[PDB]
Design a protein around this nucleic acid. Structure first.
Ligand code: MG
Ligand code: MG
Ligand code: MG
Ligand code: MG
Ligand code: MG
Ligand code: MG
Ligand code: MG
Ligand code: MG
Ligand code: MG
Ligand code: MG
Ligand code: MG
Ligand code: ZN
Lengths: 134, 76, 47, 174, 118, 72
RNA sequence: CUGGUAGUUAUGGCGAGAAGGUCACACCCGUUCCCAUCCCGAACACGGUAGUUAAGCUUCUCUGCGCCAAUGGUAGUUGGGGGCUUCCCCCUGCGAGAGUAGGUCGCUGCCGGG
RNA sequence: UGGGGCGGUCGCCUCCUAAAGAGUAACGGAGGCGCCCAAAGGUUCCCUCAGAAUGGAUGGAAAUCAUUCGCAGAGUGUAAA
RNA sequence: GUCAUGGAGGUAGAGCACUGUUUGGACUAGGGGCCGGUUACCGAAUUCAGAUAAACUCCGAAUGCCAUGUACUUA
């Protein structure tokens, strides 16, 4: 679980994810990467699930980079609670991913392993992805 | 349930006269906290940093050095 | 910290009101203030 | 006093010969000295500072400048306002007369002045002696001295680098 | 220790007195420059930046000095006469960042004793 | 040199007990002795123990003298 | 040529290197006088120039740091119109930020001595 | 008053929401106030902070002193701008 | 109402120059142990590359706003 150690403000706006990615749309460290085609929120539980699946397939070989981090939090209300009387307690952490953002990077493995470890991870995310090379 | 809900009363700061406009002496040209704009020629500063005209003329918003600004009144 | 009044030393009329700390200034404060009746500066002492 | 009779007469030409200076203005000088003791234990006792400042004045010959505290530190039950130590900044004829007794009668009064102590240089060319025993100077009253705190003696010079700073004190006697 | 800079620190002080003292056509500014041996007097208006008068130890004539403290008083006598020649009567005294104790001071009374109003 | 407030101070010539080394200096103690070295500017006399005159880095009564006289 | 004193968004600053001069300006020498040190003639103030261009200062070289700065392209967006609406597309007008070519070791006014 | 009750709030100041003039709501998101100072007010004169490196004695990671770097990384009675 | 000219104002966008959040290298400053390393009992600071922000800003629009005009049209 990727969580910030501390935050200035517990509550936060939700924002919007319209427009192409601000930066990081080119693979820099590794040789292969997942490029998001659509845009949606990505929680830290989905990052961990996609990280283990891609690492395990390599038998702990090569190197793995995570290009996103869940800075933003979100809240919720219990069932049976009317509207109003403040804001809900925080529940989790998300990372708004815009289209074109590179999410993971891979190096140190042959192409066939790289093209396969990425698709196992891509089935754990709610976005439409792509595989790109340097 | 919930704290918060308190807020102050808006103080209506900002520019009160336009560049190139004739103003009578004593008229307020700018209300501010601190000195966002410095007084210039024929312009004083009040107790709470309001800029007022000391004589009749045309308002001119001019530029001091690279990171500063001032307002002056030039008699016609 | 209380509220005090200053009294002229010739007219005897109370012209000014100020404040002072009663624990730090237990004495009776004296100041030289303009007295409207005589139109001259005059020593004023707290009542 | 005699240091003028010993520095200007023969020390001045020696530096130029040994270093090949372009002009005479590059021969290093002695600018100022300070005598900082530090009585931080007096944050609770107001009687220690009276004797130490008086004792330091007789050792030097000028009024000590009672210092204060700059920042508040929690772990030493100390805050702003109370005095912490004092210093004297003498200059002029007293500059060499103080060193006149310091390198002649004060140093031998120590248990062992022969300790080289060549690593005490700031790195820009200033020597800071740290004599802590309050008995070296033969002017302080030994019996009247109640406590024993530590002291600093700082030599600042117009020497750009260490070798000509160390060289000067060698010719002056150190 | 870095050697102190006597003139440069004065410019900081001279800029402080200049925030409230300025020269105009009606009332010019009387500035003073003091060196280790010479004292220079100048009259300036800042509306257009010209010199209206100037006198010092380097003048054409009138060479008579004593302790270079009443020599300034001699300078003040000349600058007051030269300034009043063109009709300048009221001026403001600019210290130049110095104090108002010795040579800079005694220069001022020389102008006041003559036809000049501060 | 603010007047009066500063403590007393006056140059005094010291002499080593081992060699009577004339050493012009300054101090704040009269030492009840005054000489006329360098006539025209008289200096008091204040004796001192081993100093730079005979310092080793730069035995008279007690210590060894009792030790040698006793055991020899 | 030099010493003052101003204007101008550092293209003017910082750093590095060389030269020069007691005609100026400096460093300098001492504290009798005036004045001053929470102490110290260090500074402020006072009387002269034994010595030196080490410094300050004034000139000359740079792109090392910094600063200024286009053209093209892109993001965004007023108005009009369409979709399958976490948002997207088309037409017209405006049009950045970042990056780059390039520029910079200042330019003007008055007075006094040479 | 997302029915009423229970709970919470009721006047003033600062910030975001607030859509680059001003204004702008919610039981929206964060904090303070109901004072204090006879100097912490007026004026004249003067100078410059935090931190770090090194040198040192009580005294260590930090007390005081000395040099260098240092556009404010300090301070501005108290909350924020 | 449009046109021309002049201003005040930090949103969209962007950026990391400050403040928070943050990824991978270099460098492991350190001080007491173990046998100069291990700092495996740590990243404290500096640097390289890459991100993030309603209550961040070295920057910064389109619009809207306040004026001037003797311009053209219009009530
Ligand atoms: Mg006020
Ligand atoms: Mg007020
Ligand atoms: Mg600039
Ligand atoms: Mg363009
Ligand atoms: Mg641009
Ligand atoms: Mg608006
Ligand atoms: Mg507004
Ligand atoms: Mg409350
Ligand atoms: Mg204050
Ligand atoms: Mg316009
Ligand atoms: Mg944005
Ligand atoms: Zn009366």
């Amino acid at each position: 679980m990727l969580v910030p150690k501390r935050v200035k403000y517990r509550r936060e706006f939700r924002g919007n994810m319209r427009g192409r990615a601000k930066g990081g749309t080119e693979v820099a460290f590794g040789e292969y990467g997942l490029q998001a085609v659509e845009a949606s929120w990505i929680t830290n539980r989905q990052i961990e699930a996609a990280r283990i699946a891609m690492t395990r397939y390599m038998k702990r070989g090569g190197k793995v980079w995570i290009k996103i981090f869940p800075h933003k939090s979100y809240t919720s209300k219990p069932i049976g609670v009317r509207m109003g009387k403040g804001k809900g307690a925080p529940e989790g952490w998300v990372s708004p991913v815009k289209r074109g953002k590179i999410m993971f990077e891979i190096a140190g493995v042959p192409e066939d392993v790289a093209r396969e470890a990425l698709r196992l991870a891509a089935h754990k995310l709610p976005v439409k992805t792509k595989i790109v090379k340097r | 349930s919930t704290s918060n809900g308190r807020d102050s009363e808006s103080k209506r700061l900002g520019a009160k006269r336009a560049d190139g406009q004739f103003v009578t002496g004593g008229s307020i040209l700018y209300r501010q906290r601190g000195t966002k704009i410095y007084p210039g020629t024929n312009v004083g500063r009040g107790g709470d940093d309001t800029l007022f005209a000391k004589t009749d003329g045309v308002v001119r918003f001019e530029r001091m050095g690279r990171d500063k600004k001032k307002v002056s009144v030039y008699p016609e | 910290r209380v509220n005090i009044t200053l009294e002229c030393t010739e007219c005897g009329d109370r012209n000014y009101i100020t404040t002072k700390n009663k624990r730090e200034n237990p004495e009776r404060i004296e100041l030289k203030k303009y007295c409207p009746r005589l139109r001259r500066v005059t020593l004023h002492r707290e009542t | 006093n005699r240091l003028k009779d010993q520095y200007l007469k023969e020390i001045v030409p020696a530096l130029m010969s040994k270093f090949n200076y372009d002009s005479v203005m590059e021969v290093p000088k002695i600018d100022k000295i300070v005598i900082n003791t530090g009585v931080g234990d007096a944050t609770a006792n107001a009687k220690v500072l009276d004797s130490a400042v008086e004792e330091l004045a007789l050792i030097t010959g000028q009024k000590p400048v009672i210092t204060k505290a700059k920042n508040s530190i929690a772990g030493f039950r100390l805050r702003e306002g109370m005095p912490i130590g004092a210093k004297v900044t003498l200059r002029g004829e007293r500059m060499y007369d103080f060193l006149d007794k310091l390198v002649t009668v004060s140093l031998p009064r120590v248990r062992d002045f022969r300790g080289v102590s060549k690593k005490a240089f700031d790195g820009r060319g200033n020597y800071t002696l740290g004599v802590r025993e309050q008995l070296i100077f033969p002017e302080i009253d030994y019996d009247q001295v109640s406590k024993v705190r530590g002291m600093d003696v700082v030599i600042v010079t117009t020497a750009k680098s260490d070798e000509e700073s160390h060289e000067l004190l060698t010719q002056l006697g150190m | 220790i870095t050697k102190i800079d006597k003139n440069k620190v004065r410019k900081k002080r001279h800029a402080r007195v200049r925030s409230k003292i300025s020269g105009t056509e009606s009332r010019p500014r009387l500035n003073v420059f003091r060196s280790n041996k010479n004292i220079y007097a100048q009259v300036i208006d800042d509306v257009n930046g010209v010199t209206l008068a100037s006198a010092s130890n380097l003048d054409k004539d009138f060479g008579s000095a004593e302790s270079k403290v009443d020599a300034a008083s001699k300078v003040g006598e000349l600058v007051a006469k030269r300034a009043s020649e063109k009709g300048i009567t009221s001026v403001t005294f600019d210290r130049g960042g110095y104090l108002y104790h010795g040579r800079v001071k005694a220069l001022a009374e020389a102008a006041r004793e003559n036809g000049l109003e501060f | 040199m603010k007047t009066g407030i500063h403590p007393e101070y006056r140059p005094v010539v010291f002499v080593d007990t081992s060699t009577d080394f004339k050493f012009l200096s300054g101090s704040t103690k009269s030492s009840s002795e005054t000489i006329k070295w360098e006539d025209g500017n008289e200096y008091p006399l204040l004796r001192v123990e081993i100093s730079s005159d005979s310092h080793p880095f730069y035995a008279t009564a007690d210590g060894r003298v009792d030790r040698f006289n006793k055991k020899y």
